[PDB]
């Protein structure tokens, strides 16, 4: 937020009165920049766990498990997974995420768009340091490392292991001896390929990933629109237009009306910044939870109940989403419960 | 951090010279021209021969206008504000005379006459004088002259140097000399030289006298924002011109003189509007104040005769000797802004009351007049004019016109008229339309004799009521319209609606009566030119989204700028580069312009390599301050911009029947730091 | 203000200072509350890390260190704590040829704590984190069913 | 929180001055309702496993 | 205020009360948001436990 452009605009009279008023501007911006670097630290702590960009192996079948829907697709410019392509569509992101250049609002024919109703009033949107293609490079490295090494690349160097020979231990970890896998390897691989097909087709109908990710996109966008509309409040002055006061009244009497607008708009900025700090804390909590879930479900196999999935955790796969992450949790779920005497 | 009139850093300074007839190889010259003042002057002069004596200040430099004069002669300095008739080429008199009974007889060759002197000041002589040598200017004297609110302010400094033909670089802080209350309009000025060789001029008409290479420098002050650093004694020891370069702009948003390595979002200390604009409609006709204020008869207060004032120019100057106003009170508008405003509707409301009742013509008043006769409203937005009129409304027998109401069953509402003339039964018995016990005729006639106290004398009141709507203007002030600069971030004033922004031809369509349009935020974003009917839109002068990338002020002083969301070809148009200092255009055009996905990065050399990120620019690009000694021979460090790397690319050798099993381990000990508490305060 | 103006006019100027100073204090207190929450979160994380790394050995990945957690030691610091995490980090990564369920005597043989590595024409069994091969005995192995495992190489299982 | 009842009570004069003043009331209530549904989500996430 | 003063002068005194009470509401709402975060943390801990 540029302080003078929001409060005063282009007004040497107002810009002079804001000087002797106070030095809140520096304090307000110190808080907003602390939030901004935290948004990059969150993404780093979630996605840059491994610093080795493992290439996806040229093999595409691992004992029957397909993986073609969660691995990167090399056809289109975005080297994202089929499902990651499906996730970046359910989130509208009708905001400054879609770039609006400055020349788009200089030459205009009908009415000024809100995106530059806030631009012309000192409210800018900084872009994230990591490109959405860099997030996809990090997730593809994690999937490769996982499906080709298992436990090993999180605790050290990647040690190659056959996949079905790996799912044997994944079964040994939940209390099921190895032979149960090899004796059901084809049925097990089929049950796995069907569930991913189900999540794929279900990520095309109801728009439920929109739940928590679109909610934070709508929150941020709405706060800026509120901050903009609040420039039409009088706050006790004879007008909410600064050039109306400056046209009718002389400096001694115009300073009384301007100081009301200055106080009201400084309060509006302070409210915005406080709400942003609270939401930044609420999202840092979720980012820490996601950084824990990655290292404990993708780089390992957790014994914690209901932490990675619902049943007995086997493995997990990360998928990048706009301003977030998606975890595909694979569990065991025994279902037959035949009675016995014991 | 203050906004005031300052001499910009690295600004143009004009260099003037003299004859030096004893050093120009038998060649002379006479040039100390008349220069503009322009909101303040910076004057510096390296000299050795004490040839500079003082200055002249004024507008016409004739007897028809007062002027100011400063002459430091030897002992004491003389400052006079008289009416001088200066000569076309003024200079001081004697130089010296050795044992001829004429030692230091300084006669003024400056003015032919001095009259009607108002101010006179004498004090000790400025920095130093009476030196005589060559090849070294052992004294640099600087002066800043200001003239604001009647006072003439001089600030000076005196430093010893030894140079030849250079205004020496370095920092300069001038201390206040004098604040003189001379109160004169000052527009031009001129320097006083001491040119004499045993005589002022030659035998008949030439200089042919001592000319010791007089040379001075002149700079002009501009409205700027500076960041000053006061020391323990209160002396300014350092400053920053916030409008100089991207680095100064950063040291001003962070009110500090040292900047750490990083990228900083920046406030707009960049552009300043230089010219203003007035565009009023064609009215060219004066309002009928000669017949509104100067009439044979006015209305009675109860029949107060509202009339309207359509297309005309409201110039209250015409009534200055015509009438004297005892009351002139404006509501919702200031009396000093009535010249800069245009109104869409105006009304008159003229009547006559006694002198003691003029106070009852304010919004929230009570009384016989404010209750039963006139009753101004609460949100008035107008001016109330009143003036004694005993010379026209008083007769030697009495003037029994101008009735007034005294009895009414309820207070009048705002701007309501009443001529009911019924009988007003005061008690409870019926009135039957007959004046009797409790039945009074409600209108009574004022009696205005010439032998009355100033409380019972008649007063003519005029109550102007105007509004400011989006309609076209009808009444305008005496402001004179200027041209229409429509690209250059000016101050504007169209129909009394002021502002500051960039005017530009618009494609918006207005209704036939519309004069301006607003936005989601109640800010004027388009205005109609009332002289060409053309609609043109307004753009802010400030461009937001400028981030300055610096490697630290204790490491270097070269920076890179990031113009967020701006095409690299439209940077000079977005920041208004032609209105910036030359040290700003270095960062609008460039040898190395790099268009990132965030914006245009100007100042850094885009390399094709990749490193771990040092200063995050955004959208995948980071930047750092790397040396080039291995990149080029005798190469200095610079700022590079690269696409950061996510780590070493690797590949796993996977297959159906191959496993890797470790043969050795490595016990490692890593640290983890967690804050547990913070300082508790009360 | 109190020197130049009288109480009726000084109260107007003082009430402005009172309002702004109260707002300055309110802002300070709100920022302090937000930072106190952010530091209570870290203090809870440290109270979890102590009881789960120093008073125990955690199986959680990357919770106490980087590799496989062995133990941890606390060190006090100004307004905080330092943890010295000791991990395992296996590092030599030599390749081998492996296969599950060696088929001997018409029955499958799966290992307990093993992966069935193979030398040149020789087969053994090793624990996953450290190369230590044994002979395939009846106690390094359990048996279940016929030989239908997708690879099932042939061996002795003495 | 009903905004006008706290600030103004029953005062058409005050209720008219609060209108042109500003629209914080709506943003104030947006925050309090987000808190209220979170209190139900907490209880659900704890007990309706 | 509304009994003793007229609208032009009563609006000056009312705007002070409006500002003060709006600030009082904003302080309440900010404290409620902070406590709601502190209790959402505990509710998540209980849902984990
Ligand atoms: C040089 O400046 C001196 C400053 O003292 C002035 O001397 C005055 O000369 C006038 C006559 O012109 C006398 O009436 C005053 O008595 C002198 N000054 C004093 C001592 O008050 C004078 O303005 C300049 N020129 C001369 C003649 O010295
Ligand atoms: C400025 O000087 C002029 C010229 O001397 C003054 O005008 C004369 O003033 C004298 C002195 O009272 C009168 O006797 C003359 O009748 C005036 N002449 C004319 C034609 O005006 C004038 O008074 C001076 N003004 C000031 C401000 O002192
Ligand atoms: C406007 O006129 C109405 C009607 O003539 C006035 O109301 C009457 O006031 C009289 C005297 O106070 C009462 O006897 C009647 O009962 C009222 N009639 C009604 C319909 O209420 C009213 O006072 C006038 N208002 C103004 C300010 O002039
Ligand atoms: C794997 O997935 C692809 C794409 O969904 C599908 O067409 C195919 O039937 C699956 N089988 C293979 C080749 O493993
Ligand atoms: C037997 O199993 C069924 C479901 O498997 C269960 O509903 C039932 O209660 C069990 N016991 C008896 C006695 O039926
Ligand atoms: C300033 O000086 C430069 C360099 O000598 C010259 O090119 C330019 O015309 C000067 N500008 C002004 C305004 O004097
Ligand atoms: C202040 O002034 C004194 C004497 O005028 C001088 O000695 C000192 O160096 C100055 N600067 C300070 C005290 O910082
Ligand atoms: C102005 O008033 C003076 C003083 O009565 C008078 O002499 C003069 O004629 C009037 N008119 C003008 C145009 O000065
Ligand atoms: C005012 O009225 C008088 C009538 O005596 C007339 O002579 C005069 O010209 C009018 N105008 C002015 C400006 O005095
Ligand atoms: C007003 O004046 C300008 C120039 O003085 C002229 O071009 C224009 O036609 C006039 N009329 C209108 C309606 O602008
Ligand atoms: C920048 O402008 C050039 C020329 O006008 C155009 O070719 C290019 O596509 C533009 N790029 C952007 C990002 O605006
Ligand atoms: C960077 O690589 C591109 C790709 O060919 C090339 O066009 C450009 O000249 C290179 N720039 C430098 C500075 O090496
Ligand atoms: C063998 O091991 C090395 C490192 O131990 C590894 O780089 C390689 O991919 C493995 N496989 C082959 C076939 O070399
Ligand atoms: C394991 O590594 C250490 C590291 O120096 C080495 O000294 C030791 O001999 C190695 N053990 C082996 C090769 O068995």
Numbering used by the authors:
A (entry chain C): 732 to 1073
B (entry chain A): 50 to 731
C (entry chain A): 976 to 1133
D (entry chain B): 732 to 780
E (entry chain B): 976 to 1024
From the paper:
Coronavirus RaTG13, detected in the horseshoe bat Rhinolophus affinis in China’s Yunnan province, was identified as the closest relative of the SARS-CoV-25. The spike and RBD of RaTG13 and SARS-CoV-2 share 97.5% and 89.2% amino acid sequence identity, respectively. Here we report the cryo-EM structures of the RaTG13 and PCoV_GX spikes at 2.93 Å and 2.48 Å resolution, respectively. In the RaTG13 spike, one RBD contacts 28 residues and the N165/N234/N370-linked glycans from the counter-clockwise monomer, and 13 residues from the clockwise monomer. However, the RaTG13 RBD bound to hACE2 with a much weaker affinity of 500 nM. The SPR experiments showed that the D501N mutation resulted in the most significant increase (~9 fold) of the binding strength with hACE2 (KD = 57.4 nM) among all six mutations. This tyrosine is conserved in the PCoV_GX RBD but is replaced by a phenylalanine in the RaTG13 RBD, which is expected to disrupt the hydrogen-bonding interactions. Although the pocket and interacting RBD residues are conserved, the LA did not bind to the RaTG13 spike purified from insect cells in our study, as well as to the RaTG13 spike purified from HEK293 cells in another study.
The homotrimeric spike (S) glycoprotein of coronaviruses forms a trimer, which plays a critical role in host cell attachment and entry by recognizing cellular receptors and mediating membrane fusion. All three receptor-binding domains (RBDs) of these two spike trimers are in the “down” conformation, indicating they are more prone to adopt the receptor-binding inactive state.
